[PDB]
Amino acid sequence: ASRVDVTLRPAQYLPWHPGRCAQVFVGESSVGHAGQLHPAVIERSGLPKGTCAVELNLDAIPCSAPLPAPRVSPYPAVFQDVSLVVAADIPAQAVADAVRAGAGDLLEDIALFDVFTGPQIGEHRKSLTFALRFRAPDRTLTEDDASAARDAAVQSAAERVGAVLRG
Amino acid sequence: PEALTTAVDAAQQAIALADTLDVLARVKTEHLGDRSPLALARQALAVLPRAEAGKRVNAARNAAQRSYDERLATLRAERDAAVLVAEGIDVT
RNA sequence: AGGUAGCUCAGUCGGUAUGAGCGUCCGCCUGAAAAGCGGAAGGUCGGCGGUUCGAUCCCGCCCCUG
Ligand SMILES: [Mg+2]
Ligand SMILES: [Mg+2]
Ligand SMILES: [Mg+2]
Ligand SMILES: [Mg+2]
Ligand SMILES: [Mg+2]
Ligand SMILES: [Mg+2]
Ligand SMILES: [Mg+2]
């Protein structure tokens, strides 16, 4: 509604649950918090179990007047999925940003659709699987061109968050 | 009587030995419950002709209550702290 | 005059809170419910302090409602 981008980072800030609390940033400026309230706060206050809350400072959110000019390529897209294993406390957003940074301009959309833990993965690890949609601006992208972009994304996530290709 | 070594000391070692709220719940009714030996002193504390023994009998429960209270809160703190870490999520 | 379990209410006039109703949880019932039975969990007895070996009970002050 404010036409701004927003990042959520882990934080500990009462009355929020210290493990279910995000601090909200616009750029590098904190603007509020969100998540589930602390269970001790909930009981002492007579609140429903699992109550969640969000509070933002509107005056800390800068006003934006963007003038978009989206690139709309009509050429076919290539769909590929990548399954990456990382440590269990590596935020999924950091893995996605690393994948995006390596994929380059051919990457049109990235979406996380599976977070998996288990004996197949290993202790203290988790597996994330992203759906990737590649598209070229001037040509029909080939499977090899997309795979080269996928491999570069895997290399980026490896260097930045220690991701390992799922085997 | 004189149960300062067989009732207070027998409970302060069984209370500190419990590492679970379920284990501590059983030690409660066995050493401080209504059927406890320490409870038998107060159940027959009015059939006595008080001043020289009441503060010595009450001190047997004032010392056994502290062991249960300082262990209950400790195990409650460990339980509450463990639920919070087990409920962590990736907020991103 | 009273304050008593999460709520609504009896009791206990110094030395094991006697208890209910609702609610909550848990089994019976239902594919699952509601309702019903059945049982369980559930009580520093208003704060602050004295008196006392020991206070829900007696004394001082104050919050609370008619
Ligand atoms: Mg393909
Ligand atoms: Mg294909
Ligand atoms: Mg009467
Ligand atoms: Mg009852
Ligand atoms: Mg009963
Ligand atoms: Mg039950
Ligand atoms: Mg209670």
Side-chain angles (χ1 to χ4, degrees), chain A, chain B residues 1-44 46-51 53-92:
Chain A
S2 304
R3 294 193 309 271
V4 301
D5 286 327
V6 121
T7 53
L8 280 63
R9 309 172 188 175
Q12 290 75 42
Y13 185 71
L14 287 178
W16 278 276
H17 186 309
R20 301 187 174 183
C21 168
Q23 184 175 195
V24 182
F25 288 80
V26 176
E28 294 304 322
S29 302
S30 168
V31 297
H33 298 79
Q36 184 184 337
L37 289 182
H38 198 293
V41 173
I42 289 182
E43 193 177 21
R44 290 199 296 267
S45 300
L47 292 172
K49 289 185 178 179
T51 298
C52 295
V54 37
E55 182 167 27
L56 306 181
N57 176 11
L58 270 199
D59 293 339
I61 301 177
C63 286
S64 58
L67 291 183
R71 288 173 39 191
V72 184
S73 174
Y75 292 89
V78 182
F79 296 81
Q80 291 181 351
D81 297 349
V82 54
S83 202
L84 293 182
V85 178
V86 298
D89 52 10
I90 298 295
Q93 185 58 51
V95 185
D97 291 335
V99 167
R100 193 192 299 275
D105 290 332
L106 291 183
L107 184 73
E108 165 169 303
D109 184 73
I110 173 177
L112 172 73
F113 68 87
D114 179 71
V115 185
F116 181 78
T117 65
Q120 315 87 328
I121 308 303
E123 279 287 352
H124 312 98
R125 293 171 180 82
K126 67 185 175 190
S127 180
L128 313 165
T129 302
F130 302 85
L132 306 177
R133 186 169 73 244
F134 299 104
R135 198 194 306 270
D138 55 4
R139 61 198 161 89
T140 67
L141 204 67
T142 67
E143 286 284 346
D144 291 356
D145 291 65
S147 292
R150 182 189 79 257
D151 296 333
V154 172
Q155 177 69 25
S156 177
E159 303 160 326
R160 293 163 184 260
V161 302
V164 178
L165 194 55
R166 172 88 172 274
Chain B
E2 179 64 26
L4 194 57
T5 60
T6 59
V8 185
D9 297 353
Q12 290 189 351
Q13 61 180 359
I15 287 177
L17 210 64
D19 303 323
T20 306
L21 292 178
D22 304 323
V23 181
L24 188 58
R26 302 180 182 180
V27 183
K28 171 186 179 179
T29 57
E30 296 177 19
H31 299 60
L32 278 81
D34 191 71
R35 210 177 182 179
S36 166
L38 281 174
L40 302 182
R42 172 145 283 183
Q43 296 175 240
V47 299
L48 176 76
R50 293 179 178 264
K55 58 176 57 183
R56 198 180 67 260
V57 167
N58 290 331
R61 194 178 71 173
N62 290 129
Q65 188 70 30
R66 272 188 169 268
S67 297
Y68 174 80
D69 290 358
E70 292 177 356
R71 201 80 187 108
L72 174 66
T74 290
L75 298 178
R76 279 177 177 175
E78 301 170 12
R79 178 202 62 183
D80 294 353
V83 171
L84 293 177
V85 52
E87 286 181 353
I89 64 182
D90 180 1
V91 304
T92 81

